[PDB]
Design a protein around this ligand. Sequence first.
Ligand SMILES: *NC[C@H](*)CS(=O)(=O)NC[C@H]1O[C@@H](n2cnc3c(N)ncnc32)[C@H](O)[C@@H]1O
Ligand SMILES: [Ca+2]
Lengths: 75, 954
Amino acid sequence: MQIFVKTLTGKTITLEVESSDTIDNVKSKIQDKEGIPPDQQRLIFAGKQLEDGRTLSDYNIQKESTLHLVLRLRG
Amino acid sequence: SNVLIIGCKGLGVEIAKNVCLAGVKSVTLYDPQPTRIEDLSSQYFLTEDDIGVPRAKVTVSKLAELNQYVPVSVVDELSTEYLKNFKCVVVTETSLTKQLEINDFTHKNHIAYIAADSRGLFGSIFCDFGENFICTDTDGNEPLTGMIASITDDGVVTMLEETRHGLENGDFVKFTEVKGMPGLNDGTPRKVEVKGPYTFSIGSVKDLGSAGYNGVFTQVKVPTKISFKSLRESLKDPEYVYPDFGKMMRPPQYHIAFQALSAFADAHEGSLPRPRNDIDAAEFFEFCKKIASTLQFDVELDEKLIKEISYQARGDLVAMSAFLGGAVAQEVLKATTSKFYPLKQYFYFDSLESLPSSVTISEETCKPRGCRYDGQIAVFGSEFQEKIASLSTFLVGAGAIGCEMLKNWAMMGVATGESGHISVTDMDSIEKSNLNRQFLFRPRDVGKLKSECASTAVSIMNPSLTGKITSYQERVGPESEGIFGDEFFEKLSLVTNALDNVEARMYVDRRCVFFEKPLLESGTLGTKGNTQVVVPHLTESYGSSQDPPEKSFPICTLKNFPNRIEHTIAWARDLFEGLFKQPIDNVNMYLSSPNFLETSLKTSSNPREVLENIRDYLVTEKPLSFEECIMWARLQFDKFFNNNIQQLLFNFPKDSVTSTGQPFWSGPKRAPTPLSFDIHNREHFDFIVAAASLYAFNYGLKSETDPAIYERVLAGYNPPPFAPDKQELKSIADSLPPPSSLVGFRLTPAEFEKDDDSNHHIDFITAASNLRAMNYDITPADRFKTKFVAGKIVPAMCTSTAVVSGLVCLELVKLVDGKKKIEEYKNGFFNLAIGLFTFSDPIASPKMKVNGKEIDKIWDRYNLPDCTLQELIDYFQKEEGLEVTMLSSGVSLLYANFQPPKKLAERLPLKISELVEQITKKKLEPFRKHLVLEICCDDANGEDVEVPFICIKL
Ligand SMILES: *NC[C@H](*)CS(=O)(=O)NC[C@H]1O[C@@H](n2cnc3c(N)ncnc32)[C@H](O)[C@@H]1O
Ligand SMILES: [Ca+2]
């Protein structure tokens, strides 16, 4: 399938993943695309922050779903 | 950029505050409705002694006092053709019919229109900038740029080695210094087609050359026509903007309910449904059904959710007001500046999880009592109100975020009860700043402690807090653990950060984790912001995660004790403005407006500086040759790197203390040392050159870069030595020359520009920054690095601050309710530049099995006495079946099972306190009650079993 990831900065990332890919695999693909360690990615889907160890089906993530890649600010 | 704001309740006044602090041409109010006690639930410019008077009349005095460059007036009537005198119109507390009329008119005459309403825990926003609105910046992000390896003849640009371009399909880019293709560097943008994270096509450019090499590409921001539909033709099929994809089915419910609310109002003499009333809720739900059948809205109406808007129809919460007010103010900024992508077009938001469950929320509890908290009680209930009153908060920091948080706590009545109390702390002091307006801090408040001044203003807002706010002036860190110790926390209810650095956040997080106290955390970055909550034994802490490396640097307000070079860069920019801009504009408008003094007597909040600027820049210190500009620059050096620091040290000697007795001088970076000018030192010489060039540019005189002239003039000029208001102003003003001497003399004001390298701007910035760095022992930077770091400074915006404050308070009402389920808390993230919001359940704290028992890796711990190391080992072996392999305190390794027995026989029979004293070579201060030890152990199989930490009591 194909999911989308929108960022605080307003950038969209198209990802080609399967239904049962672990959250870790999606984080590593986002890394390959942009280069952010998984331990620093904050992925949110339907009011839930994707934790490692789970899968996309565990969060009921379907085709053309839209995740949010966010981060914390300190200013 | 003229703005009109209809409605001056909590939401409207918040919008006006943020619009004034942000800065626009003018601001106009309209709200003749008499003031009501309940209005004081979220409106902080209304006093209990202002009941019965129109609201705008009494808030205009306090809104104009915010920004002096933004005049605020009031209008008592409102015509239709009058709305043409405004670039944007904002509407709150207005029926849907008058809204429709006004929006029809504006949209027909191409006039921005923004409607907003705050109803309990529900909020609605609508925008309409006409069918031909132009937006010059769609995301606000700084243009991208990259090093090009090569460019094929078909347009395949490739990146240098493995550099990412980060472009999206549709972006336009221009090129510079491209070998092989000359015609590509002119500047004509070309559409981008991404084909990978390191390559992208731009189309056949083989007419410009057979190939290109070693270039530099830079993104171009293209305008965009956004076509908005009038509120009328968009009411059937509105376009939503979802704040929480987890609540995807709620925006339509709210779109119908906010109309049914106006209908119910029209049908009952303007009255709104009573708080938590059932028959009113039934009438409201039937109005919803009617409006849904008329608009042909094919949606199943949620009865409970909808009636929850009738129940909370009279709710006026300060948190919702702050949130939506920051949002709508940023939308007004979008409308005026044509920058950032606005909401298109409907925005329906709720914080329903904030509703309490530990108390009874019926009609008898939420009933109006006749006080300021009415608008709040209607949502939470008298009972809950007391829980708010009996609060013990620790606010860390009294900056913009801290001031917003205090205003919210005050409107909410936090700590007003018998046992309630507030504890604020922030070492910084209020210092002038010609480019930074603040909410509570006034120019007259300069020289005071932020915490105390904020406490005073808050008390003015809600006098019920007087004597309830202990305002400390301490830095929060390891040294301040004598004041903020065990006794200080055992009384607290919750802690709230209003910080600007990550180290303070981490320290406060560790402290809160130790004392098992909830924490609220907020941060900003230009138009972006985030909000996080930490709940004991529930969520993981702020330190349990790491963030990416900061790509930019945020500045809220100049710091009194700089530590990094960015602080001195910002300071040097503020100095640039104060020296080569504001005085010159004062002189210019003095010789251009005939009644400059007559009006400055009122408008300006510091007429002394205006008069002194006019004096020194027009006559007293008027340069007639470049050498006189060099003398001026010498004097400015003495003023800003010698005399000021001497006076500072005279006011705060190296051994002074604070209100509690701690050392006034922080620790990280000690007190500054003044500078003695010496032209042979090149920083001093570069400052002299840049300042002289700018001062000569101001008066049109020719600048020189030959050191010979500088040496000539400075060989015979030494400024004077240095050692540490009613009639004076008028005498100085009368000591001016007649403005009738207008000879068209224009003083060219310095418009800051960084991309140019022949204007001596970055020169001045670098010189002043490095001199101030030298003052405070900071690593200086060079021309290139200074330019780069200056390009990456972002000033915090009041809007994001208000938004984070609102969200933090919405989480605070959860914290006081005692909610123990993680699904009900919400960490928030937002970027206002693109109208993006997101919320996510916090991450639960990781639980672990030890001896077959679940324990929290972050909150649970072992509490032991000050025993001997052998006693502790034996305890963990016999009471826990654990072979302790490592025991450490702080960053010091105490015991390890592999160390030689000689080294151990001298440490096994010692008490843990004595062990720490011997290992650290530093005795324990007397006020330490507890010690924290990390340990690593192995079970009976020799396998490392992770375990909590130890709290040794002594
Ligand atoms: N990025 C948002 C703007 C930041 S702010 O609103 O101006 N808050 C910064 C404020 O907190 C003080 N600060 C920094 N570290 C502190 C410690 N350890 N203790 C107390 N205050 C502390 C700053 O001086 C600002 O006043
Ligand atoms: Ca009725």
